[PDB]
């Protein structure tokens, strides 16, 4: 019964990676270790490691001191500013600015605010909206590829595996048309720069899309020319 366990493993892995990637904030990942200013009313410079993570629905900005306790305070921050149709970015930025959290986090949050010169908000609010809708479409197709394989219509259960594998690479494109503009915008942090490159979720979606596109095709060709 090895082949049955293999089929169950493949189906469950594909479903799990679709679900996890649609809700993961790791599509674009940058990281750097800079020397920045901690916060207002103090002339003291700190040593921290700063990095942002963009996930189709908002950004995570993490400020963590290399010594977590270096200025009598513990430095471990992880703030989230979301721009999806449900929420608003400017109100979140205003509340964060009224709170008083450290300056580099406020800066990296400002880079994505609406009407900023860099214009990084309206191409992340729509690309991350379409690449999160073409990943809810590649789920209803995976469910149908799970059903049509249970009650054998495999001749038609090998096309849902060309639709799921295509609707993933049709969403790995909307989030591919954004690094074209995030590259010119500067992200200088004190004496260091910040390079944001494609992260785990992107490569995982690429691998899963390729796997489904190939598996559906091979199984369809086989069960067509040889229903063994």
């Amino acid at each position: 019964r090895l082949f049955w366990l293999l089929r169950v493993v493949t189906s469950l892995f594909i479903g799990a990676v679709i679900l996890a990637v649609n809700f993961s904030s790791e599509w674009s990942v940058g990281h750097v270790n800079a020397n920045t200013t901690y916060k207002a009313f103090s002339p003291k410079w700190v040593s921290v490691d700063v990095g942002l993570q963009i996930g189709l629905g908002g950004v995570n900005i993490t400020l963590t001191g290399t010594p977590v306790q270096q200025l009598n305070e513990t430095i471990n921050y992880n703030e989230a500013f979301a721009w999806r149709l449900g929420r608003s970015y400017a109100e979140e930025y205003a509340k964060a600015l009224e709170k008083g959290l450290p300056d580099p986090v406020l800066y990296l949050a400002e880079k994505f605010t609406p009407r900023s010169p860099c214009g990084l908000y309206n191409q992340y609010r729509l690309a991350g909206h379409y690449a999160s809708a073409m990943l809810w479409v590649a789920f209803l197709c995976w469910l149908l590829a799970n059903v049509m394989l249970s009650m054998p219509v495999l001749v038609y259960g090998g096309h849902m595996l060309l639709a799921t594998g295509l609707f993933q690479l049709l969403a790995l494109f909307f989030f591919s048309m954004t690094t074209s503009l995030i590259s010119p915008c500067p992200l200088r942090l004190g004496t260091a720069v910040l390079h944001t490159h494609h992260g785990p979720a992107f490569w995982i979606t690429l691998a899963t899309g390729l796997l489904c596109i190939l598996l559906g095709l091979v199984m369809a060709v086989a069960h067509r020319m040889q229903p063994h």
């Binding site: 207002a40 009313f41 410079w45 040593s47 010169p117 309206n122 009650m151 219509v153 004190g190």
Partner: protein
């Protein structure tokens, strides 16, 4: 870690005072000196019935010559350095919008704006940004918000934020990014950064020639660009000097040190150099930093400072080089230089230095009510008009903001009261005071109404009036004494004692000498004054004589050339049906290669459930449409988008929900397994499940009508958008549009073929036209495969219909709310109908009978076990497609070679009769029985089988099987009663009645016939009296008796009434079976 041993000053302004982190910030709100003076009390501005007309007030008092010299010899570099400084502090010019205008109304026959006496002409004017948390009750009226850092912190050189101070920096040392020329900044940062207004003299609105400064609009005059370039080059100079004296320093260290030095020099110059010259009295002194003073910009400061600086701008500005040869007539006119992109003279650093050395020697105009014509008549128009009165827009802004009057705002500052009009300016009325009379006549001799611009300008003799002077002075003292990063603050740790004593000895001559590399003896010690001993005198006072005239007016026409293209695009959209019609036509040609009351009563009797269903469906759709349209028209809607597009937006937003619902449930209609299960339940007695295709076509037609309405509404919308300014469009669809002053909206074809909704809407129109024309009655009878090939577009349709709402243009997507349940059910039923398979019956024999019926008989597959009264659905592929049509079997189960009786009633049936004509070769695709096979007449001693109309189809099988089983096995006296109108198509049924009568010798089945058709018949060669029937039935034999009935609603209702009226006293179950 480095040499930045201080707290770097933020760009936005926050966190400057410890207690209140918000006082001087990017979007703070202006703090009034006097309670708001709106019309209603909250946000309504005073207007023309109450206060005189702005364009008629400007003409009467603020109009005159342009050759008057200043009384204190203030050089025009002072005027424009003031224009520069007062853009570091306050900016209330950008219109924040839920788009709301208050226009200027020109009088009749204005020689400049209404030259041909065209009745009344309107100058547009828009309200500015307001604080969203104010303007809702007379306790807190609306307050505006300035969009620049309200400190004197060089918020005009380095921008007022941090993402802004990056887009104009090079990170190559501490330096602001220059262009190919080291002297000028980089024009290459033009979009998304600066203000682009079309040069009103030519019309060019391109991003070439728009430099990158820290003030969004510093390119408004070459004379303001001159000071912008001066400060830019000074920053670069001091920074490169720092680099050549501290080589190992980074980029940030150089930038921050040069920035703090430039900011300190700027503050020193501005305060202690410009104020003692603007109003001729020195700021008092510097006490300790006061952490409690309120440094909030007031609107009266805006009025005083800027709308008084506008009183002394000259007509033309001179130009001279180091030895002052005033050529580079050469005095470039002002009214032709607004927003100049590339000026043929100011194309090199030497020319900018010449412009500065010429401004620093030209005595600006005098300080009184008279304003030159280069601002009064020829100020660049904000929208649609290319020209605009300045002083008639400054009054509209003073009444836009809640500015006080001149007598109300003269007693809230401790100043004495004025008696009458002659006492406003006592020295003015001593010589030609016929302007105070002209302005009293305008105000109906009512002194307590002066809008505080004509009241302030009328009191200023040689200096600003006693009213403007106190406002400017105390505002600047509050700016300096409430600032933590003030260069004279010894607590902030920015500069030492000698670095403060060195910054406090810097004049504007030192900066000009350092930047322009000019000998210090070619200028004057105080650049803001020319005092009869300073070098390089003026040639002659510059009157507006001998200067090039001002470029005349022209109205701007959006939607001017692209009207024919718009009409052609609409005509092409409308001729989508014609292209599909032609394609299907060539496809066909290629494939060929007192009594009326009773009539209405019978009709309403038959068609009750159909009327109920149609009424409920159309009620629901109309309710959705009415909800949306009512919510939009006059209801709880933020009236941002609904100004003149009420009709279009109402139409579109009302039809959208209705068509989404109609499409989702027209998908629901075509699911046949659920219908096959449901039509054998009590639901059928309330809704008819045999009219699903008619309901389908009805829904389709209604949906196409509503879709045409939707598309027409959106076409009207797209037209009304292509003529709206950018300032209006930029707050209907925020995020999609941005308001740089270019003001030209996107063309129609941008909305149509370059947006997701428009493009997918055109695609959906094409797909709908194809699918609707190929599905016509006169185009599916010809080719069943044409019909079958196009209709698979509905998946493409339901893909597009998700992309059509995938945007935040008007509202949130709601189609996916409607589409879930019907699509889930339909996909489930498709999987159910696609799992089971049965195919390939062989037709044994098929004779052709009259009246249309075609007796068909095919072999019985081995596994085929079925009951009496079950139908099968068959398809012949020889002619057309694999279209499954249902037919009730007419053979007893004990008999092999299952039979059928098919009645010619349309395309498929006539084609099938043509196929099996000439008596049987083709083979069908029988799809098994579909029924419950209710055999409940075994539980009743005596049954009464009643069939009417079309419902007499399975009774042949029923009776044959019943007599066979009664004979073989060895249900008492079952009776069959069938009432028909014409007895036309059912003659084979009479043959079967005869064959059953002949077979039965035990006298079980007794048939009875009622033909019920009078006076209209062919003689064919009464009524079914159920009332005495049951009375005699129980009498003749003492049997519970079943009276199962199948037929039209009239007959079954009649037999129901009969059996119920006669039941009350056996059982008489009356179990109406729909086969």
């Amino acid at each position: 870690q480095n040499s930045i041993s201080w707290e770097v000053q933020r760009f936005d302004g926050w966190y400057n005072n410890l207690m209140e982190h918000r006082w001087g910030s990017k979007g703070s709100r202006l703090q009034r000196l006097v309670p708001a003076s709106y019309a209603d009390g909250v946000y309504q501005p005073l207007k023309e019935p109450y206060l005189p007309n702005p364009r008629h007030l400007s003409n009467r008092v603020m109009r005159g010559s342009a050759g008057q010299p200043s009384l204190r010899n203030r050089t025009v570099l002072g005027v424009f350095f003031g224009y520069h400084v007062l853009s570091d502090l306050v900016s209330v010019e950008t219109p924040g919008c839920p788009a709301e205008f208050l226009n200027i109304y020109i009088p009749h026959g204005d020689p400049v704006f209404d030259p041909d006496k065209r009745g009344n002409v309107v100058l547009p004017f828009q309200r500015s940004r307001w604080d969203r948390n104010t303007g809702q009750s007379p306790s807190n009226p609306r307050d505006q918000s300035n969009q620049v850092t309200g400190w004197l912190d060089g918020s005009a050189i380095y921008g007022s934020s941090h993402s802004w101070s990056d887009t104009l920096r090079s990170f190559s040392g501490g330096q602001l990014a220059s262009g190919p020329d080291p002297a000028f900044p980089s024009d290459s940062q033009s979009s998304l950064l600066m203000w682009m207004a079309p040069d009103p003299s030519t019309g060019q609105g391109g991003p070439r020639g728009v430099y990158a400064f820290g003030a969004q609009r510093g390119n408004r005059e070459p004379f303001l660009q001159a000071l912008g370039l001066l400060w830019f080059r000074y920053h670069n100079l001091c920074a490169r000097k720092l680099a050549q004296e501290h080589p190992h320093w980074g980029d940030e260290e150089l930038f921050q040190h040069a920035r703090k030095r430039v900011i300190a020099t700027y503050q020193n110059i501005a305060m202690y150099e410009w104020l003692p010259s603007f109003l001729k009295q020195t700021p008092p002194e510097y006490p300790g930093y006061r952490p409690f003073l309120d440094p909030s910009i007031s609107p009266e400061f805006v009025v005083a400072s800027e709308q008084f600086l506008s009183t002394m701008v000259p007509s033309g500005v001179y130009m001279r080089n180091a030895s002052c040869h005033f050529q580079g007539s050469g005095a470039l006119r002002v009214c032709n230089s607004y927003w100049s992109r590339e000026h043929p003279k100011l194309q090199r650093a030497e020319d900018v230095d010449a412009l500065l050395l010429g401004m620093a020697s030209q005595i600006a105009e005098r300080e009184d009510h008279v304003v030159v014509e280069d601002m009064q008549d020829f100020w660049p128009g904000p929208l649609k008009f290319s020209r605009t009165d300045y002083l008639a827009s400054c009054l509209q802004r003073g009444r836009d903001l809640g500015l006080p009057s001149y007598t109300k705002a003269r007693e809230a500052l401790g100043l004495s009261p004025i008696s009458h009009w002659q006492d406003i300016n006592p020295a003015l009325s001593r010589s030609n005071g016929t302007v105070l009379e002209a302005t009293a006549a305008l105000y109906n001799q009512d002194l307590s109404r002066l809008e505080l611009l004509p009241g302030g300008l009328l009191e200023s003799h040689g200096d600003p009036g006693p009213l403007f002077s106190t406002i400017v002075l105390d505002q600047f003292v509050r700016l300096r004494d409430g600032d933590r990063y003030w260069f004279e603050n010894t607590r902030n740790g920015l500069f030492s004692k000698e670095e403060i004593a060195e910054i406090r000895n810097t004049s504007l001559r030192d900066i000009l000498v350092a930047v322009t590399n000019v000998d210090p003896s070619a200028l004057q010690p105080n650049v803001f004054f020319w005092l009869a001993g300073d070098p390089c005198p003026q040639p002659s006072q510059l009157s507006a004589k001998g200067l090039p005239a001002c470029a005349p007016l022209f109205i701007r026409d959006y939607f001017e050339g692209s009207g024919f293209g718009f009409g052609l695009t609409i005509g092409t959209l409308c001729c989508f049906p014609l292209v599909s019609l032609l394609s299907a036509w060539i496809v066909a040609r290629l494939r060929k290669r007192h009594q009326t009351v009773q009539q209405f009563k019978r009709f309403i009797e038959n068609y009750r459930r159909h009327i109920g269903c149609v009424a409920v469906f159309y009620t629901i759709t109309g309710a959705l449409f009415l909800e949306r349209a009512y919510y939009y028209a006059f209801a709880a809607h933020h009236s941002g988008i609904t100004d003149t597009t009420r009709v279009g937006i109402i139409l579109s937003r009302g039809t959208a929900a209705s068509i989404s619902f109609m499409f989702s449930y027209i998908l629901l209609t075509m699911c046949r397994n659920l219908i096959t299960f449901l039509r054998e339940t009590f639901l059928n007695r309330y809704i008819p499940f045999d009219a699903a295709v008619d309901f389908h076509r009805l829904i389709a037609s209604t949906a196409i009508i509503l879709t045409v309405l939707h598309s027409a509404g959106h076409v009207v919308n797209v037209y009304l958008f292509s003529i709206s300014p950018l300032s209006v469009l930029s707050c209907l669809f925020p995020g999609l549009f941005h308001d740089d002053g270019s003001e030209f909206p996107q063309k129609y074809y941008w909305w149509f073929f370059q947006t997701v909704p428009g493009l997918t809407g055109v695609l959906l129109l094409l797909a709908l036209a194809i699918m609707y024309v190929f599905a016509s009655h006169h185009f599916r009878r010809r080719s069943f495969r044409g019909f079958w090939l196009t209709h698979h577009l509905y998946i493409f349709l339901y893909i597009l219909l998700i992309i059509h709402g995938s945007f935040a243009l008007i509202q949130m997507p709601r189609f996916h709310i409607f589409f879930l349940v019907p699509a889930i059910i339909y996909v489930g039923d498709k999987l159910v109908s696609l799992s089971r398979k049965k195919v390939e019956i062989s037709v044994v024999k098929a004779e052709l009978l009259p009246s249309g019926v075609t007796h068909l008989r095919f072999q019985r597959p081995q596994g085929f076990e079925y009951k009496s009264g079950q139908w099968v659905r068959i398809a012949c592929l020889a002619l057309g497609t694999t279209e499954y049509h249902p037919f009730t079997l007419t053979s007893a189960p004990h008999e092999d070679t299952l039979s059928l009786h098919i009645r010619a009633a349309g395309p498929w049936t006539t084609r099938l009769r043509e196929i099996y004509s000439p008596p049987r070769y083709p083979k069908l695709y029988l799809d098994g029985p579909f029924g419950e096979g209710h055999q409940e007449w075994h539980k009743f001693e005596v049954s009464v089988l009643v069939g009417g109309g079309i419902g007499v189809t399975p009774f042949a099988s029923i009776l044959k099987d019943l007599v066979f089983k009664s004979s073989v096995s060895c249900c008492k006296k079952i009776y069959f009663i069938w009432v028909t109108r014409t007895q036309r198509q059912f003659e084979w049924l009479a043959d079967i009645i005869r064959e059953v009568e002949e077979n039965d010798r035990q006298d079980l089945v007794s048939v009875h016939i009622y033909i019920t058709q009078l006076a209209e018949k062919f003689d064919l060669r009464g009524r079914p009296p159920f009332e005495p029937f049951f009375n005699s039935l129980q009498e003749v034999h003492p049997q519970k008796i079943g009276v199962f009935s199948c037929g039209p609603p009239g007959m079954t209702k009649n037999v129901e009434k009969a059996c119920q009226l006669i039941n009350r006293q056996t059982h008489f179950s009356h179990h109406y079976e729909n086969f």
